Amino acid sequence: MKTGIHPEYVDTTVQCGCGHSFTTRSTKQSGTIVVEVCSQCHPFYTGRVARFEKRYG
Amino acid sequence: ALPRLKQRYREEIREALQQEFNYANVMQIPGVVKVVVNMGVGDAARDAKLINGAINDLALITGQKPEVRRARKSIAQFKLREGMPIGARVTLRGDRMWEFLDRLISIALPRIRDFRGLSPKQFDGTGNYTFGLNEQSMFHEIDVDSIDRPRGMDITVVTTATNDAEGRALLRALGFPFKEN
Amino acid sequence: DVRPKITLACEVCKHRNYITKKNRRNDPDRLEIKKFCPNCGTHQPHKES
Amino acid sequence: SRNGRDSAAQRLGVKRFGGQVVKAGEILVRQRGTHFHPGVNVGRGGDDTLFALAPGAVEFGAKRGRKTVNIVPVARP
Amino acid sequence: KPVGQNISEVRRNARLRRHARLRKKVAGTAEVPRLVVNRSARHIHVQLVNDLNGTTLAAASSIEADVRAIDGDKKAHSVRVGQLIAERAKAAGVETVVFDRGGYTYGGRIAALADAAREAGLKF
RNA sequence: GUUACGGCGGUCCAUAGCGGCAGGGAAACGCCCGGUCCCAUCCCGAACCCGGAAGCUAAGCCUGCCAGCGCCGAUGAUACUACCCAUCCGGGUGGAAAAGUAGGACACCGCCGAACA
RNA sequence: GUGUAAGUGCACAAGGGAGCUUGACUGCGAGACGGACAUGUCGAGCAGGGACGAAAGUCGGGACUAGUGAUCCGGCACCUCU
C-alpha cells in the first residue's frame, strides 16, 4: 500500500433519520456523519369521468 | 473485520443463490469480480483542467487515485487527437469494492433526485450490469459548495455469473433498487 | 537552419571531436554526452561548442 | 508524360545454392525482408543479408513454416 | 459453461508464451546445457537440458523426499533444490550452464535457487 | 516394466487445429485463502511477487469416442510446355499442373520425473 | 500498426508500454556480394574502454531498400612530422 497516493480514513458514525449509530470507517473528518435519508428510511426500500362525478354527480 | 456487504454475501446470499439455481459444484456460485467507474469528459480536449476536476471527483468518491485514459484514435468531428486525456477510470476490487458498493447502495442511490429505480434490463449476456449517473452530488464525500460543474459516471459491475438472470438475481439479493418488468 | 552539424569537444583538453546533428529548437541548450576519448583511453563527457 | 523515373536494379537473390561449399563470411542471399530466415551457422546483416558463420555446404530447410538457410559442416577428409 | 476463459488459461498461456520468447536467446549444449526451472505454488523443479539431442543430464525437485524433509519456507526448499542440482551436475561433469527461468520473473524462490546453484559451484 | 500423471524437446509444425459428447485429481497440475515479509499496479495483491492449504475438479490439464468444421490428399485425364516435323491447320517424342475426385486424418516420435512393481 | 512512396517482411513480433542509458564508440578486420573503372554493400571475429542484464548475452544508429556530390582549392582543431 503506497503511503502518499491516497487520502485518509477514519471510523465515523453514520447517522440517518431513523436514529442509528453506524460505527464504520469513512473519509469525512466530522467524527460522526449525519445523513437525512438512507436505505433504512427510504420509501423505495420501505379519469375525467370521475372528475365530472365530483363536480356534478 | 469484514465489510458488512461482503459478510452478508458470504453467509446468506451464497446459500440463497445455491437454492435458487442448484449449482452442481460449490464454485459455480456467481460473485462480484470488479467495479469500474468511467468518467469520460470529452470536453477536456479543449481544457485539461476538466480532466483534473474529474480526477479529484473520482478520487474522493472511490477513495483511490484514478487513472487517466488516453484517446487511442484521432477524430475530426470531435476534433480529437491521439494522446490527450479524455476520461478517467478506477478499478475497484476486494474490500474497497465492497465498501464502495455499500456506500453507493445505501447512501448515493437514495440521494438521487426523484429516484425511481434502475432498470434490470442493462445486463449483457454474462450479467455484467452497467448504469450511468449524471452528476456527483449524491455522494457526500464531495462538497456541493466545492463542486462547480456536473460530472456523470458509468458504473459497471462485472460478476462471475454466466447469464443475465443470474446476474440480476445476485444484484437484487445484494440490494439493488431495480424497477419491475 | 534546422538540424545543423554540431561540434562537441572532449571536456578534458585534447580537443578530441565527435560530430553529429540535432534540432536547434528541440535542444536549444548546448548538448552534453559522454563518449570514448582515444588518447585518454577513457569515457569522458563531450561539450557541444 | 509524368512517368520515366526508375531506380537501379539491386541484384538481389540467392548467391549460393543448395550443396555449394562456402567459407565463413560468404554472402548466401541478398534480400530485402526476411524471405529466408537464418538457420544454423547462418547470420543476418543490417540489410537482412544472410551469410555463413562457418565453412560447409548450403542447405535450404523449413523451420516452423519459415524457409531457412543452414550450413552443414562437411566432413574433414 | 463459463462465458470466457478461466484465469488459469490466461496464466498458463502467458507463461508458455513468455518462456518461448526467451528460449530464442537461450539454448543448451552438451558442455553448456540449459537449466530450465518450473515453479508451482507448492513446488519447484529443475532439469539440465542438452537442446541439440533433446535429453536431460540432471534433474531435481522439491518432490524428492530428502529435500521435503527440510522444514524451511518455500525459499528454503528452492535453495536446497538448487544445491541438489548443483551437486548432481558436479557428478555429471557439467561445469557451466545457462539459467533458463522458464518464463517466470527472476525473483523470490527462483532467484534464491539460482543463487544457491551459483555459490555451490555452477558458473552461470 | 506399468498409470485417465507432470515437465522439457522435435516434425518439410493442423493428418496435429477448432467444435461436440462422455470421465477423472495417487503424487503432480491447477483453481483457491491472505497481503506479514522480497516485490507490483501508468489506478486496482486483477496481474507480478510472497506467505499457506479450508474447499473444489466447476474450469485449465489430460483420457476415450464423433469427419462435424477446418486440414492433408492421390492415380487417370486435361491445361501448359522443351525439342522436332509440318506451307496455315495440326502432329510426334519427353516433362507435366491447378481445380476436382478416391481417400487420409479426432496426431506421431524422443528424454527425464511422479505413483505403482 | 510499423515516422515517411512502394515492395519484401514483421503477431515468435521488426507492432504498443515501462526502467536504466549514449555502441549515433576508438584501433582493426578473415571472408565475400556487386561491379568497365570510379563508386557502393555485408561481415563473423580480436583489442581497448563502456551501456543494459542475475546471467547467457546484445549494442560499431533507426524492420530493410531513397534523404545525396568525385577531384581541385581553401577554413578550423590536434600531432613526438618538416
UniProtKB/Swiss-Prot annotation, chain A:
GO molecular function, one term: rRNA binding
GO biological process entries: translation
Residue numbers binding Zn(2+): 16, 18, 38, 41
Cofactor(s) this protein requires: Zn(2+)
A GO CC term attached to the entry: ribonucleoprotein complex
Residue pairs linked by disulfide bridges in the UniProt entry: none
Keywords per UniProt: Metal-binding, Ribonucleoprotein, Ribosomal protein, RNA-binding, rRNA-binding, Zinc
Keyword RNA-binding: yes
UniProt cofactor note: Binds 1 zinc ion per subunit.
PROSITE patterns referenced in this protein's UniProt entry, alphabetically: RIBOSOMAL_L31 (PS01143)
Similarity comment: Belongs to the bacterial ribosomal protein bL31 family. Type A subfamily.
Record-linked NCBIfam families: L31, PRK00019.1, PRK00528.1
Quaternary state and interactors: Part of the 50S ribosomal subunit.
Function description: Binds the 23S rRNA.
Protein name as annotated: Large ribosomal subunit protein bL31
Swiss-Prot record, chain B:
GO process annotations (BP): translation
Domain of life, per lineage: Bacteria
One of the record's GO cellular component terms: ribonucleoprotein complex
Ranges in coiled-coil conformation: none
Pfam families linked to this entry: Ribosomal_L5 (PF00281), Ribosomal_L5_C (PF00673)
Gene Ontology MF terms: rRNA binding; structural constituent of ribosome; tRNA binding
Keywords tagged on the record: Ribonucleoprotein, Ribosomal protein, RNA-binding, rRNA-binding, tRNA-binding
Homology family: Belongs to the universal ribosomal protein uL5 family.
Assembly and oligomerization: Part of the 50S ribosomal subunit; part of the 5S rRNA/L5/L18/L25 subcomplex. Contacts the 5S rRNA and the P site tRNA. Forms a bridge to the 30S subunit in the 70S ribosome.
Protein task: This is one of the proteins that bind and probably mediate the attachment of the 5S RNA into the large ribosomal subunit, where it forms part of the central protuberance. In the 70S ribosome it contacts protein S13 of the 30S subunit (bridge B1b), connecting the 2 subunits; this bridge is implicated in subunit movement. Contacts the P site tRNA; the 5S rRNA and some of its associated proteins might help stabilize positioning of ribosome-bound tRNAs.
Name of the protein: Large ribosomal subunit protein uL5
Curated annotation (Swiss-Prot), chain C:
Pfam families the UniProt entry points to: Ribosomal_L33
Protein keywords: Ribonucleoprotein, Ribosomal protein
GO biological process: translation
GO molecular function: structural constituent of ribosome
InterPro entries (UniProt xref): Ribosomal_bL33 (IPR001705), Ribosomal_bL33_CS (IPR018264), Ribosomal_bL33_sf (IPR038584), Ribosomal_zn-bd (IPR011332)
GO CC entries: cytoplasm; ribonucleoprotein complex; ribosome
Superkingdom per UniProt: Bacteria
Keyword Ribonucleoprotein belongs to the record: yes
Family recorded in the similarity comment: Belongs to the bacterial ribosomal protein bL33 family.
Protein name per its UniProtKB record: Large ribosomal subunit protein bL33A
Organism: Mycolicibacterium smegmatis (strain ATCC 700084 / mc(2)155) (Mycobacterium smegmatis)
Gene from which this protein is expressed: rpmG1
Curated annotation (Swiss-Prot), chain D:
GO biological process: translation
GO molecular function, one term: structural constituent of ribosome
GO cellular component terms, A-Z: cytosolic large ribosomal subunit
Spans through the membrane: none
Annotated keywords: Ribonucleoprotein, Ribosomal protein
Pfam families: Ribosomal_L27
Signal peptide: none
UniProt entry tagged with the keyword Ribonucleoprotein: yes
HAMAP family: Ribosomal_bL27 (MF_00539)
Family listed: Belongs to the bacterial ribosomal protein bL27 family.
Name of protein: Large ribosomal subunit protein bL27
Organism of this sequence: Mycolicibacterium smegmatis (strain ATCC 700084 / mc(2)155)
Lineage of the species this protein comes from: Bacteria, Bacillati, Actinomycetota, Actinomycetes, Mycobacteriales
